[PDB]
Write an enzyme that holds these catalytic residues in place. Structure first.
Site, PDB file in Angstrom:
ATOM      1  CG  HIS A   1      -0.440   0.511   2.447  1.00 20.56           C
ATOM      2  ND1 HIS A   1      -0.247  -0.299   3.534  1.00 20.56           N
ATOM      3  CD2 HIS A   1      -0.270   1.782   2.889  1.00 20.56           C
ATOM      4  CE1 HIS A   1       0.121   0.432   4.576  1.00 20.56           C
ATOM      5  NE2 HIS A   1       0.136   1.702   4.207  1.00 20.56           N
TER       6      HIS A   1
ATOM      7  CG  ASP B   1      -0.296  -3.706   2.891  1.00 18.17           C
ATOM      8  OD1 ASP B   1       0.205  -3.300   1.791  1.00 18.17           O
ATOM      9  OD2 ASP B   1      -0.596  -2.911   3.818  1.00 18.17           O
TER      10      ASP B   1
ATOM     11  N   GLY C   1       2.704   6.611   8.654  1.00 21.05           N
ATOM     12  CA  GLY C   1       4.147   6.707   8.377  1.00 21.05           C
ATOM     13  C   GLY C   1       4.951   5.594   8.966  1.00 21.05           C
TER      14      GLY C   1
ATOM     15  CB  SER D   1       2.583   1.782   6.493  1.00 22.89           C
ATOM     16  OG  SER D   1       1.309   1.993   7.060  1.00 22.89           O
TER      17      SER D   1
END
Lengths: 12, 246
Positions: free
Chosen positions: B46, B97, B196, B198
């Site tokens: 993502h 993801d 941030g 991630s």
């Protein structure tokens, strides 16, 4: 957008 | 990282800082990642899906500060950007993801291990710590949900792993969480990953070994009661990782 999963997305 | 503590890259030397260059030349932080071999960083799809062109990105290793060079750091272009074919997203939830970045310097080299730059081990298949186990998360993400800025100094915190069965309850995330995801949170909800963070590492000690258990993926808010952080469960993607690491 203020949170996790949309980092670096054009619509944010 | 909401709550937690400031740290430096010695305490998480596999942590990768991923940035995107803009048309016009400004550079902005995107996401975290983890060095799993000298030429490969693992992160979240993502982070890249809206700008999926490898030439847009810059990867640093050995970096403790967001906007200032750290002595010893290394800077890499992205030779290949591999996103997961079955990625999808809900309003909240992101499936599959996971992303791989193959890194190469201007000189054509991969990472060189040092006191500030090390790889992290992958887990054995289908082998995760038991619920309630304490694990660590690292990143340059927001310190409060309402913040505008990211912290300049790297942070880390500790969260505890939550069972499938618990994370499944309507008043948590119901059907949004799958078996390829892991939930983790603080018992007072007072510390967490945020915007941030991630792509960054969720690290647990497994058979006395520091292991990449998870990859920061999603959540409803940050450090919010009954809303854990949600992590891609690395132990369920080992064939994908093995195969794509070319």
């Amino acid at each position: 957008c203020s949170a996790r999963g949309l980092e670096n997305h054009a619509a944010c | 990282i909401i709550g937690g503590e400031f740290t430096t890259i010695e305490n998480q030397p596999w942590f990768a800082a991923i940035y995107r260059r803009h048309r016009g030349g400004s550079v902005t932080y995107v996401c975290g990642g983890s060095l799993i071999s000298p030429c490969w960083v693992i992160s979240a799809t993502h982070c890249f899906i809206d700008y999926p062109k490898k030439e847009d990105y810059i990867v640093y290793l050995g970096r403790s500060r967001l906007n200032s060079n750290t002595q010893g750091e290394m800077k890499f272009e992205v030779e290949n950007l591999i996103l997961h074919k079955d990625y999808s997203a809900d309003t909240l939830a992101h499936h599959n993801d996971i992303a791989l970045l193959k890194i190469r310097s201007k000189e054509g080299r991969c990472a060189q291990p040092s006191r500030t730059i090390q790889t992290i081990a992958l887990p054995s298949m289908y082998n995760d710590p038991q619920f309630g186990t304490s694990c660590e998360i690292t990143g340059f993400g927001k310190e409060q949900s309402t913040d505008y800025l990211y912290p300049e100094q790297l942070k880390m915190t500790v969260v505890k792993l939550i069972s499938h069965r618990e994370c499944q309850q309507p008043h948590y995330y119901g059907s949004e969480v799958t078996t390829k995801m892991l939930c983790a949170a603080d018992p007072q909800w007072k510390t967490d990953s945020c915007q941030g963070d991630s792509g960054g590492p969720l690290v647990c000690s497994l058979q006395g070994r520091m292991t990449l258990t998870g990859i920061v993926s999603w959540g409803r808010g940050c450090a919010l009661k009954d809303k854990p952080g949600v992590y891609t469960r690395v132990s369920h993607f080992l064939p994908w990782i093995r195969s794509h690491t070319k």
